[PDB]
Amino acid sequence: VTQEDIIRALASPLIKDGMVDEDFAEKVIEQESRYPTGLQAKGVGVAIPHTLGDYVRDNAISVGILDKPVNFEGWYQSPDPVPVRVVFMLAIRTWDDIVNVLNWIKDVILDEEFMKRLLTMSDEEIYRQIYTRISKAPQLSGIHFKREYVRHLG
Amino acid sequence: ELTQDPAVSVALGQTVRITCQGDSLRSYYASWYQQKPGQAPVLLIYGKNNRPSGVPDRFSGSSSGNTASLTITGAQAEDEADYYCNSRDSSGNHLWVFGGGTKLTVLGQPKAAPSVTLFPPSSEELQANKATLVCLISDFYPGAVTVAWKADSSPVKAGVETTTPSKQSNNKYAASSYLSLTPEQWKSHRSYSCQVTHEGSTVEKTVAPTE
Amino acid sequence: EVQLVESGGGLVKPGGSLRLSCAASGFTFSNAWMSWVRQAPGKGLEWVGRIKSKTEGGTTDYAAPVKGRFTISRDDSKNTLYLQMNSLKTEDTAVYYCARTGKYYDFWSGYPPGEEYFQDWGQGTLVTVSSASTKGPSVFPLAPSSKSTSGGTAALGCLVKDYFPEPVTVSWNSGALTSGVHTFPAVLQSSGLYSLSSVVTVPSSSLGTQTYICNVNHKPSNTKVDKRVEPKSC
């Protein structure tokens, strides 16, 4: 189960709600190969794939938990890829908004115990935990987050 | 809100640190610009320590507390310039606030005594009932001169306008000084002198209405 | 190559209005954030304002002393940025630069929404706000004599007195004389008028036989002056 499989699967429900252009997955794939988004958290790799806001109609996040790690190239330069198990796909129109979501995502990936639960919880439980967190961030109020925006892959 | 020393010197080939200080640097990065006289500013460093392509790796950026620093290793004469930091004030009168600028001078270039030429008023300016003495000072380094004027043997401490020295090509400096007087003043004195002091030694040129 | 060409600067009375334009090329203008930065003569850089890309929301921010007097706008179909300046004041006198503005945010350390930086600058357009009126220059020869000359070479020049506003350019023999030419920075006299000088070093033995003309150009007053500089009988 490859990088393209992951991106296509996380883009699918955004495409279905028309949140994004219908070729959004291919645009994220091409942007990931130019500007990689693999990040090293403490015990686990994270990726935050996205593309330009011109391709998004309305703001949303799509979350993926990988049963086994998948290599993503590093956000930061590194000879070795980042083995990722947690993926936040972003569909954000504006620069100002995306910088706020990334700050927020940093806070959750440094939450070691929340990340610990991300690896074990159900789709439903993951939904409720992220939804609560998002709703306590007034700057995140424009971001749409639905139960079908969470899934496991593999 | 962004403080920067007005002037700093560095020996040729050594390292200089140009630091900028303000509250907003605690939370945001500084961008750094080089500006030479007569030209547009040029971006040197942005973000943490990113260089635009074409900026030499002698330039770097760093940050510590409420300060940010532009470091230039092995300074070259071509690095002489005004350096400006910029950052986010976000509550002040300028969302993007510049420091006041630091002029970098590179010491250790070859010393050169000024070449001085003084022109009297032309016949055409006199016929137009005006008169200017023109003192042109060229090819000196370091780029600091003191200019004084004399009427006859007496100094003239008003009516004088001197440009701050500016780099030529060839890395020497040039400056000008103008003495405005009336045609009768010119015709009335025995002579006027321009007196240029550079590194404690003085070159005086004299003109007289007689010639 | 990136190219930013400002235009529209000139002399204008206090309370007047002026519009600046900047034509961009060499990059995708409609993706770009674009700023205006100004520099009063002899002074530091001052940010004026910035307009975001349309996808970013197209919003403007302005410096406080300018808010409610200046407006920034953009025509992406014509790759042009504008600065509308109303209710102008003498303290608005400055060279106005248009700057392509990049944006940066560091994931692990950055603070939203990150930083803006001025990655490409045009050459600037000079805006002079004053109640004084245009004045062309008076050009006078700085004639060589035995009180110039340094043996094999001699300095001769031109004095460009009492003009307003800046700039003045100077060439010699219609630009056919370039080596040894030095043109000095202008001086702002307490009258409010500018003066500058331009000197050229030439062979001493040519002074009786080679003609030397300084070509002075003062575009603010549509004035050109060609002044022949002749050797004195000294």
Tell me, yes or no, whether C21 and C101 share the same domain: yes
Of C85, C107, C129, the one marking the end of a domain is C129
Given C72, C103, C129, the domain boundary residue is C129
- Alpha carbon B68 to chain centroid distance? 24
Q: What is the experimental resolution, given in Å to one decimal place?
A: 2.0
Specify if C209 maps to a domain: yes
Peptide bond into B56 cis (omega under 30): no
Question: Going from the N-terminus, what domains does chain B have, and what CATH number goes with each?
Answer: 3-107 (2.60.40.10), 115-207 (2.60.40.10)
Q: Do chains A and C touch (3 or more CB pairs under 8 A)?
A: yes
CA–CA separation, B126 vs B132, rounded Å?
Answer: 9
**Would the CB atoms of C159 and B93 count as touching at under 8 Å?**
no
Are C191 and C163 in contact, with CB atoms under 8 Å apart?
Answer: no
User: Residue A69: is the preceding peptide bond cis (ω within 30°)?
Assistant: no
End-to-end CA distance of chain C: 54
* Sign (positive or negative) of CA dihedral C102, C106, C110, C111: positive
C210 lies in the same domain as C151: yes
Cβ contact (<8 Å) for C107 and A106? yes
Q: How far away is chain A from the Cα of C138, in angstroms, using its nearest Cα? A: 55
Regarding whether C53 and C121 lie in a shared domain, the answer is yes
Tell me the pairing of strands C33-39 and C153-163.
unpaired
Return the half-sphere exposure (C-beta side, CA atoms, 13 A cut-off) of residue B31: 25
Report residue B28: phi and psi, to 5°: -130, 155
Residues of C in contact with A99 (CB under 8 A): 105, 110, 112-114
Residue C150 counted as domain residue: yes
Residue B162 near residue B180 (C-beta atoms within 8 A): no
How far apart CA B192 and CA C52 sit, in angstroms, is 59
Beta strands at B146-151 and B154-155: parallel, antiparallel or unpaired = antiparallel
Same domain, C34 and C143: no
The residue range of the domain holding C55 is 3-129
The verdict on C114 touching B (C-beta cutoff 8 Å) is: yes
DSSP letter assigned to residue B94 = -
CB distance A106–C113 less than 8 Å? no
Token reading at B81:
């310039």
CATH number of the domain to which C8 belongs: 2.60.40.10
The residue out of C101, C129, C157 marking a domain boundary is: C129
* Contact between chains at B125 and C140 (C-beta distance less than 8 A): yes
CA atoms within 13 A of residue C206's CA, in its CB half-sphere: 11
Q: Are residues C99 and C185 in the same domain?
A: no
Strand partners, C128: C11
Task: Identify whether C234 is part of a domain.
Answer: no
Residues C124 and C143 in one domain: no
Question: Which amino acid belongs to residue B11?
Answer: A
* A98 to chain C: closest CA residue: C113
Give all domains of chain A, ordered by start, each with its CATH number: 3-153 (3.40.930.10)
Check the CA dihedral C177-C180-C185-C186 and report its sign. negative
- In terms of domains, do C85 and C7 share one? yes
- Pairing type for strands C181-183 and C187-188 reads unpaired
Q: What would the DSSP string read from start to end of C37-79? A: EEE-TTS-EEEEEEE--TTTT--EEE-GGGBTTEEEEEEGGGT
* Residue of A123, A41, A127, A118 whose CA lies nearest to A84: A41
Q: Are residues C16 and C123 in the same domain?
A: yes
C122/C68 same-domain check: yes
Whether C74 and C41 share a structural domain:
yes
The Cα B21–Cα B2 span in angstroms is 5
C187 occurs within a structural domain = yes
Which single residue is written with the structure tokens 């935050």? A48
Q: In terms of domains, do C124 and C152 share one?
A: no
Of B179, B205, B211, the residue nearest B118 (C-alpha):
B205
3-state secondary structure chain A: CCHHHHHHHHHHHHHHCCCECCCHHHHHHHHHHHCCCEEECCCCEEECCCCCHHHECCCEEEEEEEEEEEEECECCCCCCCEEEEEEEEEECCCHHHHHHHHHHHHHHHCCHHHHHHHHHCCHHHHHHHHHHHHHCCHHHCCCECCHHHEEEEC
Residue C169 to residue C5: CA distance in whole angstroms? 19
Helix, strand or coil, per DSSP, at residue B181:
strand
Residue A90: burial class (beta carbons within 10 Å; 0-12, 13-18, 19+): buried
* Residue in C115, C121, C197 nearest the CB of B40: C121
Q: Using CA atoms, how far apart are residues A46 and A83, in angstroms rounded to an integer? A: 8
Buried b (16+ CB within 10 A) or exposed e, C106-140: beeebbbbbbbbbbbbbebbbbbbeeeebbbbbbb
With tokens 């969302």, the residue in question is B95
How many Cβ atoms sit within 10 Å of the Cβ of residue A71? Answer: 14
Under an 8 A CB cutoff, do C107 and A100 touch? no
Distance from CA of C182 to the nearest CA of B (A): 8
C46 vs B166: CB contact, 8 Å cut-off? no
C114/C144 same-domain check: no
Which residue in C125, C103, C108 sits closest to C48, CA to CA?
C125
Nearest Cα to Cα of residue B156 among B164, B148, B144: B148
Number of independent structural domains in chain C? 2
